[PDB]
Predict the structure.
Amino acid sequence: RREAERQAQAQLEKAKTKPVAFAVRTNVRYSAAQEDDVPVPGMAISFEAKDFLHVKEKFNNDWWIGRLVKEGCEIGFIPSPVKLENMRLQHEQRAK
Amino acid sequence: RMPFTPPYDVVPSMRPVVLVGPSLKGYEVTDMMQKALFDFLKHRFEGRISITRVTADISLAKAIIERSNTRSSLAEVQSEIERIFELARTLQLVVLDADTINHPAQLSKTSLAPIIVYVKISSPKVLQRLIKSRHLNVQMVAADKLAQCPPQESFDVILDENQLEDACEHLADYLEAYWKATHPPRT
Ligand SMILES: [Cl-]
């Protein structure tokens, strides 16, 4: 059940006070959709190519926790490289 | 035929500020104008800033072992990159006084993702007079190469203001906005 969402939301709240572990500059875009199964719906971090993200910690194999380096942007779930690749694969399969 | 991979690059947690222009580092006109700007940052961002000299050739940063063709070794450069990353780790503003960098293309293929600040004298005639009132050709050529860069994509900030105080306030405003983006509520 959606006890899972509650735990995910708790980990996110706990990370608000954690330091930035590392930063990345993106080479691709991510435009979040409901169907990406984000640990807490509504909390995915979308971004464009060449955006900067501050990453705090790993949530699971599909999702990190961090924020877009942009005024007013808050902590949420960032897709891992594994998750980005699986979305790219899924899209290329369905477009074929 | 017709001339048409990791999703994330790891970069410093605060993008290092690098100054380029008006001409070549190592010569008086550029060294004095950049020194005034560094001086200003040290006191405007006191307690929030680290300004550090980098002498190693960080343009060199990215089965025969790759080695540098100059006095700056790839191992020394890697050590300096690591030091820059560490400086940025706690989210202080990092400013680099990077001797070897005079053109933004020099850092384009590195992992540093700098904030490139173009200190610009928009009129070449003005630059020529400044220099001669204090090697001319290499300086003019350098300033002209900067003037040829597509400005929006090459530079993060362009300081073309005649009055030092106006250039300083422009730089400060940009860095204050970056401070806010990164913190949710010559030397
Ligand atoms: Cl799809």
